[PDB]
Write a protein that binds this ligand. Structure first.
Ligand SMILES: Cc1cc2nc3c(=O)[nH]c(=O)nc-3n(C[C@H](O)[C@H](O)[C@H](O)COP(=O)(O)OP(=O)(O)OC[C@H]3O[C@@H](n4cnc5c(N)ncnc54)[C@H](O)[C@@H]3O)c2cc1C
Ligand SMILES: CCCCCCCC[C@H]1O[C@H]1C/C=C/C=C\[C@H](O)CC(=O)NC1=C[C@](C)(CC)OC1=O
Ligand SMILES: Cc1cc2nc3c(=O)[nH]c(=O)nc-3n(C[C@H](O)[C@H](O)[C@H](O)CO)c2cc1C
Ligand code: FES
Ligand code: FES
Ligand SMILES: [Ca+2]
Lengths: 408, 206, 198, 446, 251, 412
């Protein structure tokens, strides 16, 4: 019994001594002072913040919004900044989106950058002109069986300064909506009840952030037009949650309110005299309408242009009148559409099959020099892989193929 | 059932020693005989389960400055109790197991489970994953000790199944099975056999 | 003089902690890709071991050895907790010291100290010191030699694994299996100092 | 003097007689689009178009501003294309005497000229493609400069011409070309040569350096390694003696000079000699009625580093100054690997052929063995004089490790620098292609 | 966070852990000591020829039959003390309770020797039937510890048992072979002049040898170790004076 | 003829044929008899004549003097030891009891003491040839299996591994142990790494280290090195460790082992390690051709001489191996077999001219060390080569790291 008391007291004193000594060693040896973060060169608007956190949360407070697609976490690759002074060393995950040649300039993903020392950032050429808006839904008309067109009105006459091919970010709070809430006209309804996709419903508990490409050109003031495809569970395993944000925008209707955040973008057209070939499909009609209307109307370019859209049926087609009006007034532009499963009701006398086979066998095969054109493309994933493969077998260089995958 | 997945996945799907390199030292050391492998498997099961349980009980109040001190205090107390129990009842196995009874404290399974799962989960699932990881560890230990004791000495659990020549039999024991590289070779070929049947575990050509 | 050099040569070659005693194998088998990284980790191991073994020898001989404080009281059941707590606290304090005061030495070797804070190599070194009943200078020399032997073995494995860039390993053996086989073939070669009694 | 001791002078049959004569009459030339490294052509001519001498045929997309011009005046008759529509050659039938002319200067004005005027005249004439940057062996960017321009006034290739015979006929043009290069370079021009005398340019920065020993003593990579080691941030340019003669003639006459003196030699050539020809001449007409009957291989350039001339690729290369013709070895021999070889060449001493010193071998295109892994017996060290580790660098090239390859070298190298390593490998590896793959990786990754 | 709550947590946890640990560690000391002792008790009962299974019968027979005593090596006379708890292996390293061995004196390569050693007397009623001498020596890989039982004359051997060794399990680990240990029964330790006469013979022993046992096969470097062990522990520095005292009489 | 028969059955083995799964064995026999007949396809349109076949056949032809002298010596030692022990009607019953003896007497030879060089080589062949055949077959099984499953073409290199394993083993190995040793040598040390040219250890001394540690009584002691029933006699690195140079004596003949006896090879031991003269005769040929490394050989010699001379200088009065000179280390054991044929393995050695010297020096130092100061093992050459195979890449690392700093200074 005499040994037990002694053992207990010495155990406790050893543990307490180690804890107190490590605490005291910590108190003197960690700063807890403050560091200053630097932006382009201006002494004004410089961020001071606790060393707790990363560069994303440190930039989030001072009103500087970096492109934070895919909710951070080192996935998108658009949270890239140039750091002049010593920040933090590279991470192997940052090497996935940044190459040894790019990294030399100072490119790093802001998310993995850990703020504990002062830094000097050279942010990409005055992107401080970014806003967070709130808009009133104008219409939510259904454009295809699985694609709905969301229009929004920017309030008080303000207009979004953006370029064709760019995108905005739409944030939504926690909610719960059911697929019975959706206004799906009887024109496109027959395919839904075949799977009875009205069954599903989803709910989220913290707000989400996603990006969407605009479907209007810069000189169409006072609005924003989008094309939003519904993201349903895959056919193989259908017991997984539906798309969080995709099911929200479909739940909106006239008069409702949503918030958007600023103009971004990298899918811009090059300024040359070369011919342009626009390839699209599905929800990829959004940038392809923005690029084409920018060329023929705002820039009024006289280059030769062409649009090759690939749909599944004539009920899946839309914006037809807008393109047929351009092909009549302008003789630089031409339009073609190819269906996979044309139905007898469609009255279809046109191209049939995949778009990568229709484009090749009709136009590219006899072209005098197909390597001399600029190819812009946006569509479903295996449409991008089929087209790129067909173009590479013609000699086209990847410096000419501009592809915008919808978030991989 | 939510139980059988959690207890039976770390055996082949997410095996500790064969996929999560944690835990090689005792597997290499104590698998010359099969009794020591069994006793070490049971001890690791007990310690991992109860340490996960207690760390998950007090997960909310642990300071971030002294987290390692608290977790290692719990684990070291459990291992000291286990070592005092082993000496009183199973005396001979302890002598053959001398320092790897204490080294259960620095075994990587016991700490990686307390850090990766117990700090973030309820008490009853942490007992479960500790038991499951102990089972996955004991799988490799017993499988290696079986071959080592059978071919190195011709006995299983101390029972003579192959009659040695120096005991009037026909079998001549392999001396490497009682030595150091044999455990490395056995675990390497076992990893080969496991990744042959479940080929999603194969690593990238890089 | 001959007593302390025989102990050093023994610790380095005759009783290796990596290939003879099998301590620290997960870090040994996981950080063996590049020679530079293995060298940094080995230097961290040398430092942590040579600082950890003598201090634990002092604490044991002052507190936990039989009859150290009161006649008829031995606290030898606190060896495990005392050793592991002292090792962890020492590693963390050394890491913080390097992190603040000497940034270059931090980027050099302090970036390995989280992997070594609680490792089987140092715990086994302290346990073997307690079993073998070393003096203070003997503990210093033993810790130093043990760290140097561990570093030598890990750097040799890194060199072999870099030479294996030309190999053609079956897909099921790629990685862990072939590293296990290579470490076994290294132990087969280190078995040459077996019969030496130094 | 720099003396090289590790190398190999190949004892192949058919050495030429260093006497210049007139070659066959040529009726077709071509420009080969696969011999320019990293070139993607933008075509400026169609089949049926008529061209003039020094008229543009195609440009480069990846190198803006560079023009590839016609050697002769005639009609575009073929635009050959291969896998994935890769341009193989643009064939032109020689007919007429038309040309694009430029400005002419006096022989004493060339040393004091504007670098931009020199660059402009070169790019417009299309003689800018005579240069190659090390690393990566590509045509220089028309808006870049170098501090070292290496002139190759020697030749150690097997069955090669001897530069002195050619330079003694165009001394004036050679000196004018060196005077132009002295003003074009920022720094020094290195005229790497043998011990024999050559015409001297008298600018203070044009220096003469003598190299001695067997092959590779005559490659630009050796000269760069010994005089101006190159790296990612130290680039040198390379040009040979006939291109310097062409530069001198261009700046002295205002006209593009397209005249080659190539060596036609080989074991199956009846009279090996130096012949006069034109840039890009047809190699199936240059060798007509001059080779023994049978099945042979016609090569543009050396047997160590050259292009096999068949079909659409059967035209004289741009950076090549010789043609080689040798038989095709397609025989199967009873225990041919175990015969005592009195007629078998080797760098090792496993055959009887080395005991007969001064022998000359009628070598074929045989691969004396099958493809096997690398067992290093020390053959790469016997033939590589530079200050590198051959076996480890070649294993880095094989394994595909680009970073350690760059560290161990691989940036000072061309495909012609590993020709002897490809030669003496007992595993029958081809290292020029592996080096080109590693350099493509390194140039693509920024 | 707060230092107050941190210290409260660590102190409470330390108390809760230390109570259990130090209660379990002290409550089991006597059982641990008994379990440690029963192994040596069983080895001695086995070398003495007595059959026993289970701690009950082992303790009963060891307490009724075997008697530990202490013997002074320098003079070979009995000394009084606590023989049941003597620790010769730890006493041998102590500077006061041991002696350093001269290079020529060290024939078995043990390098040290305690002043007093513990012997065990097998007792029948009150008559001393045998005496069990603990000997040890150095082999090729390890130190080898044995138990040799000698009859009252001080010459005849009744058994041998190696209870600790680490020689190759099939070459020099054959000192634990029962067929080899059975060769020792009936041998003689000393000759007519009372000098060490045990001989480990390379290549078999002639049948009828009173002094020779078969050496090990393929193991002449561990067999040399056993020979050196007996050469030392039967000499003037080992059990020589005590064995002369036993020969004269009065165990 | 044979050319016609080979190209007519080639359709049977191309994909879809009757025997397509045995294609790897057909392409081997097709290229063994006749050269492939291929041409260069890309560049360096002329190739050197050497290939792996000639390298392997030249390393194989070099060990024939050693092989034949080893067979003759095994026979002579066995006959002498037999006539030393038995005579009269015992020798007849000993001869009729062993097939190695009654086959030698059936094929025309004699087992009496007046036997000549012809019956001694016959008796030695009756021991060597079964081991060689078993090793070759059991290792070729695994080679062909790996090549068939991995769709490779079987390559030479095992042609040398098998013979080098068969000549470094005692004349009295069981055949199942030879099979196990060649299995461990080929499969574990070479084939799991990719095959020839892609491993890092010596495949023949990693199957001898399998049998030395697993079955240590059939490859050690005094009963395994003379093939005579009931004969127990020590060799000379074991007789020197016991009593020095005065203890070197042949018990079968009752004569002293001189320096010329160990150099010529009139001593017991591993089948073909005994004749330093024949080993030198073969090594001079394979070194002249440029196949073996004189830098590695010189390093081994330098290390052995340095360490043995240091041991001789510092001296010892309890260890007899401290006074063995360098010219006695050379002719005893498997020092010269290893220095000449097994240390010069190009795949396991260093890949740098500067690293080869250090590699050889380490091999020699470790051999002399394991000989002198390791009391358990009479020699240490399989253990010293296996040890240096681990640090061969580190020497290359040091040399390359020194070469890269020379580059960055723009002088290389
Ligand atoms: C720059 C940019 C522009 C874009 N422009 C457009 C545009 O104009 N139009 C457009 O329609 N899209 C566009 N996108 C794509 C869009 O932003 C997102 O890809 C996606 O639509 C986001 O919607 P969501 O979060 O509701 O779907 P998510 O929830 O992100 O989709 C997940 C999908 O996987 C399934 N799933 C979810 N959880 C699991 C699980 N645990 N296991 C298995 N399956 C699961 C779901 O059923 C669903 O099909 C763009 C993307 C980027 C980056
Ligand atoms: C699984 C299916 C059953 C297995 C098959 C059944 C068992 C097969 C077993 O009999 C072995 C032979 C295999 C060895 C292969 C490897 C050898 O290294 C190849 C070889 O000799 N190469 C040559 C040697 C020489 C003569 C000189 C260098 O040239 C060569 O061609
Ligand atoms: C000089 C030379 C020496 C060789 N020595 C050996 C040897 O000792 N053991 C072996 O298994 N193979 C040997 N080989 C064959 C070959 O190198 C060996 O199979 C490779 O290690 C296989 O990768 C040798 C080959 C050559 C050319
Ligand atoms: S997702 Fe934010 S950086 Fe990649
Ligand atoms: S056991 Fe030593 S690291 Fe896990
Ligand atoms: Ca004693």
């Amino acid at each position: 019994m005499s040994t037990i008391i002694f053992g207990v007291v010495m155990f406790t004193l050893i543990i307490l001594a180690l804890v107190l000594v490590i605490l005291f060693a910590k108190s003197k040896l960690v700063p807890t002072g403050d560091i200053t973060i630097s932006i382009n060169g201006d002494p004004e608007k410089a961020i001071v913040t606790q060393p707790g956190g990363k560069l994303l949360t440190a930039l989030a407070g001072a009103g500087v919004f970096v492109s934070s697609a895919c909710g951070g976490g080192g996935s998108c690759g658009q949270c890239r900044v140039k750091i002049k002074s010593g920040g933090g060393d590279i991470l192997p995950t940052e090497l996935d989106h940044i190459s040894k040649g790019e990294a030399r300039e100072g490119e790093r993903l802001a998310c993995q950058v850990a703020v504990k020392a002062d830094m000097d950032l050279e942010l990409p050429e005055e992107i401080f002109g970014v806003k967070k808006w709130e808009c009133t839904v104008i219409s939510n008309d259904n454009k295809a069986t699985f694609i709905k067109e969301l229009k929004l009105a920017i309030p008080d006459g303000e207009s979004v300064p953006f370029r064709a091919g760019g995108y905005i970010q739409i944030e939504a709070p926690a909610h719960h909506v059911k697929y019975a809430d959706f206004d799906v006209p009887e024109k496109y309804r027959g395919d839904w009840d075949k799977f009875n996709l009205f069954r599903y419903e989803s709910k989220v508990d913290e707000p989400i952030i996603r990006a969407y490409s605009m479907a209007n050109y810069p000189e169409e003031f006072g609005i924003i037009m989008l094309n939003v495809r519904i993201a349903t569970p895959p056919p193989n395993n259908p017991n997984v949650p539906p798309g969080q944000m995709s099911s929200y925008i479909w739940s909106l209707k006239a008069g409702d309110k949503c918030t958007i955040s600023g103009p971004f973008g990298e899918f811009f057209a090059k300024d040359t005299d070369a011919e342009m070939v626009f390839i699209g499909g599905g929800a990829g009609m959004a940038p392809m309408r923005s690029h084409i209307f920018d060329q023929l109307k705002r820039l009024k370019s006289k280059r030769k242009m062409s649009y090759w859209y690939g749909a599944r049926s004539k009920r899946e087609m839309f914006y037809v009148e807008d393109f047929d009006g351009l092909a009549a007034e302008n003789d630089n532009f031409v339009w073609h559409c190819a269906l996979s499963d044309p139905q007898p009701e469609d009255n279809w006398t046109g191209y049939t099959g995949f778009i990568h086979n229709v484009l090749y066998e009709n136009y590219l095969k006899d072209h005098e020099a197909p390597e001399d054109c600029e190819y812009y493309m946006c569509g479903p994933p295996m449409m991008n892989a089929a087209v790129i493969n067909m173009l590479k077998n013609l000699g086209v260089e990847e410096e000419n193929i501009l592809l915008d995958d919808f978030g991989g | 059932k939510e139980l059988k997945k959690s207890v039976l996945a770390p055996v082949l799907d997410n095996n500790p020693i064969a996929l999560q390199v944690l835990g090689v030292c005792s597997a290499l050391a104590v698998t010359t005989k099969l009794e020591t492998a069994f006793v070490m498997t049971l001890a690791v099961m007990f310690v991992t389960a109860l340490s996960n349980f207690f760390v998950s009980l007090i997960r909310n109040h642990i300071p971030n400055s002294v987290r390692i001190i608290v977790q290692m205090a719990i684990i070291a107390s459990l291992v000291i109790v286990v070592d005092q129990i082993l000496k009183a009842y199973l005396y001979d196995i302890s002598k053959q197991l001398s320092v790897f009874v204490g080294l259960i404290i620095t075994n990587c399974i016991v700490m990686g489970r307390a850090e990766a799962f117990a700090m973030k989960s309820e008490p009853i699932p942490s007992f479960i994953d500790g038991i499951g990881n102990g089972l996955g560890y004991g799988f490799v230990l017993m499988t290696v000790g079986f071959f080592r004791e059978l071919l190195g000495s011709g006995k299983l659990f101390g029972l003579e199944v192959l009659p040695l020549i120096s005991n009037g039999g026909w079998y001549q024991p392999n001396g490497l099975m009682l030595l150091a590289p044999s455990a490395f070779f056995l675990i390497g070929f076992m990893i080969w056999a496991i990744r042959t049947f479940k080929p999603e575990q194969v690593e990238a050509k890089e | 003089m001959e007593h302390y050099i025989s102990l050093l040569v023994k610790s380095i070659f005759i009783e290796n902690m990596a290939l003879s005693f099998f301590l620290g194998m997960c870090t040994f088998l996981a950080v063996s890709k590049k020679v530079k990284t293995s060298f940094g980790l080995g230097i961290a191991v040398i430092v942590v071991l040579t600082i950890s073994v003598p201090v634990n020898n002092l604490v044991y001989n002052l507190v936990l050895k039989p009859d150290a404080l009161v006649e008829g009281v031995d606290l030898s059941f606190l060896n495990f907790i005392t050793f592991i707590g002292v090792i962890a606290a020492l590693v963390q304090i050394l890491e913080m010291i390097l992190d603040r005061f000497f940034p270059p030495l931090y980027n050099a070797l302090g970036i390995f100290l989280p992997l070594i804070t609680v490792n089987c190599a140092i715990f086994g070194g302290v346990s073997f010191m307690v079993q073998r009943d070393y003096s203070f200078a003997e503990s210093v020399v033993y810790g130093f030699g043990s760290g140097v032997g561990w570093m030598l073995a890990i750097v040799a494995l890194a060199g072999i694994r870099e030479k294996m860039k030309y190999s053609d390993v079956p897909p099921g053996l790629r990685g862990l299996g072939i590293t296990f086989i290579t470490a076994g073939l290294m132990a087969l070669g280190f078995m040459s100092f077996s019969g030496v009694q130094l | 003097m720099i003396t090289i001791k590790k190398g190999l002078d190949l004892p192949i049959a058919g050495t030429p007689s260093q006497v210049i004569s007139d070659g066959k009459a040529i009726k077709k030339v071509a420009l080969l689009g696969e011999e320019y490294v990293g070139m993607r052509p933008t075509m400026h001519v169609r089949v049926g178009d008529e061209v003039k001498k020094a008229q543009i045929l195609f440009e480069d997309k990846k190198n803006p501003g560079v023009k590839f011009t016609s050697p002769v005046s005639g009609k575009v008759v073929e635009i050959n294309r291969g896998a994935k529509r890769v341009l193989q050659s643009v064939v032109i039938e020689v007919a007429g005497d038309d040309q694009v002319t430029f400005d002419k200067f006096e022989a004493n004005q060339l040393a004091s000229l504007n670098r931009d005027a020199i660059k402009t005249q070169l790019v417009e004439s299309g003689l800018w493609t005579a240069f190659r940057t090390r690393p990566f062996s590509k045509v220089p960017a028309i808006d870049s400069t170098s501090e070292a321009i290496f002139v190759t006034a020697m030749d150690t290739n097997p069955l090669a011409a001897e530069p002195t015979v050619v330079i003694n006929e165009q001394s004036e043009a050679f000196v004018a070309g060196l005077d132009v290069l002295s003003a074009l370079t920022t720094g020094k021009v290195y005229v790497c040569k043998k011990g024999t005398s050559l015409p001297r340019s008298q600018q203070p920065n044009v220096e003469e350096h003598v190299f001695d020993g067997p092959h590779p003593a005559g490659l630009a990579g050796t000269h760069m390694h010994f005089l101006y080691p190159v790296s990612a941030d130290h680039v040198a340019w390379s040009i040979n003696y006939q291109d310097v003669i062409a530069v001198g003639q261009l700046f002295l006459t205002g006209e593009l000079y397209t005249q080659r003196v190539v060596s036609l030699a080989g074991p199956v050539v009846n009279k090996p000699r130096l012949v006069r020809t034109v840039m890009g001449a047809s190699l199936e007409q240059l060798v007509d009625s001059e080779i023994m009957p049978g099945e042979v291989r016609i090569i543009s350039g050396s047997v160590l580093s050259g292009t096999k001339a068949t079909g659409p690729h059967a035209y004289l290369g741009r950076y090549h100054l010789q043609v080689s013709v040798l038989r095709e070895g397609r025989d199967k021999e009873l225990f041919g690997w175990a015969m005592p070889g009195k007629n078998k060449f080797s760098v090792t001493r496993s055959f009887l052929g080395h005991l007969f010193k001064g022998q000359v071998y009628n070598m074929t295109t045989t691969t004396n063995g099958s493809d096997r892994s690398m067992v290093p017996i020390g053959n790469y060290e016997k033939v590589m004089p530079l200050d590198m580790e051959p076996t480890l660098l070649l294993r880095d090239l094989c394994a595909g490790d680009s970073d350690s390859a760059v560290r161990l070298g691989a940036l000072e190298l061309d495909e012609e620098d590993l020709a002897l390593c490809t030669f003496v490998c007992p595993g029958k590896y081809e290292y020029g292609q592996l080096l080109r793959e590693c350099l493509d990786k390194i140039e693509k990754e920024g | 966070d707060s230092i107050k709550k941190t210290l409260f947590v660590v102190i409470a946890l330390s108390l809760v852990c230390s109570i259990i640990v130090s209660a379990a560690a002290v409550g089991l000391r006597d059982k641990q000591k008994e379990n440690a002792a029963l192994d040596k008790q069983s080895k001695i009962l086995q070398v003495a020829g007595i059959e026993a299974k289970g701690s009950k019968q082992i303790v009963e027979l060891f307490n009724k039959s075997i008697e530990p005593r202490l013997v002074d090596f320098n003079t070979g006379d009995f000394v009084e003390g606590d023989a049941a708890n003597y620790d010769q292996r730890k006493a041998a390293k102590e500077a006061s309770e041991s002696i350093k061995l001269t290079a020529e004196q060290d024939k078995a390569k043990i390098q040290r020797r305690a002043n007093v050693g513990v012997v065990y007397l097998v007792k029948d009623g009150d008559k001393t039937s045998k005496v069990i001498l603990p000997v040890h020596g150095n082999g090729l890989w390890s130190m080898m510890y044995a138990f040799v039982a000698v009859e009252t004359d001080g010459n005849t051997v009744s058994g041998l048992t190696y209870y600790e060794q680490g020689e190759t399990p099939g070459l020099g680990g054959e000192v634990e072979n029962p067929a080899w240990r059975a060769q020792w029964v009936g041998k003689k330790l000393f000759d007519e002049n009372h000098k060490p006469a045990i001989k480990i013979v390379k290549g078999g022993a002639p049948q009828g040898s009173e002094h020779g046992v078969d050496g090990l096969s393929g193991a002449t470097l561990t067999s040399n170790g056993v020979q050196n062990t007996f050469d030392f522990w039967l000499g003037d520095m080992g059990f020589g004076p005590f064995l002369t005292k036993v020969r004269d009489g009065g165990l | 003829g044979l050319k016609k028969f080979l190209e007519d059955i080639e359709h049977h083995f191309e994909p879809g044929g009757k025997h397509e799964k045995w294609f790897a064995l057909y392409e081997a026999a097709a290229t063994l008899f006749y050269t492939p007949g291929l041409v260069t396809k890309r560049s360096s349109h002329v190739r050197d004549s050497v290939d792996l076949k000639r390298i392997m056949i030249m390393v194989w032809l070099a060990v024939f003097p050693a092989m034949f002298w080893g067979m003759y010596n095994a026979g002579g030692q066995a006959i002498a030891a037999l006539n030393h022990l038995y005579s009269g009607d015992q020798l007849a019953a000993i001869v009729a009891g062993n097939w190695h003896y009654w086959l030698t007497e059936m094929l025309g030879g004699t087992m009496s003491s007046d036997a000549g060089w012809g019956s001694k080589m016959l008796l030695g062949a009756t021991y060597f040839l079964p081991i060689y055949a078993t090793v070759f077959i059991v290792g070729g099984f695994w080679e062909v299996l790996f090549c068939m499953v991995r769709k490779h073409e079987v390559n030479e290199g095992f042609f040398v591994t098998s013979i080098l394993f068969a000549l470094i083993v005692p004349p009295t190995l069981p055949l199942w142990q030879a099979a196990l040793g060649i299995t461990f040598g080929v499969v574990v040390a070479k084939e799991v790494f990719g095959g020839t040219g892609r491993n890092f250890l010596n495949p023949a001394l990693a199957g001898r280290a399998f049998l030395f540690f697993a079955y240590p009584a059939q490859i050690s002691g005094d009963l395994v090195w003379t093939a005579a029933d009931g004969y127990s006699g020590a060799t000379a690195l074991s007789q020197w460790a016991q009593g020095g140079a005065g203890a070197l004596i042949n018990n079968a003949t009752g004569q002293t082992i001189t320096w010329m006896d160990a150099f010529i090879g009139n001593i017991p031991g591993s089948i073909g390690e005994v004749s330093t003269l024949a080993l030198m005769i073969g090594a001079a040929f394979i070194v002249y051709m440029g196949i073996a490394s004189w830098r590695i050989i010189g390093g081994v010699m330098i290390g052995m001489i340095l360490l043995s001379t240091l041991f001789n200088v510092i001296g010892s009065d309890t260890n007899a191996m401290f006074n063995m000179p360098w010219h006695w280390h050379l002719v005893l054991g498997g020092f010269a077999f290893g220095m000449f044929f097994m240390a010069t393995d190009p795949v396991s050695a260093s890949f740098t001219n500067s690293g080869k010297w250090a590699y050889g020096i380490l091999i020699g130092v470790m051999c002399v060390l394991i000989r002198v100061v390791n009391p358990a093992y009479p020699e240490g050459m399989m253990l010293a080569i296996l040890f240096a195979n681990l640090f061969a890449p580190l020497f290359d690392h040091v040399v390359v790291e020194r070469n890269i700093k020379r580059r960055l200074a723009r002088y290389g």
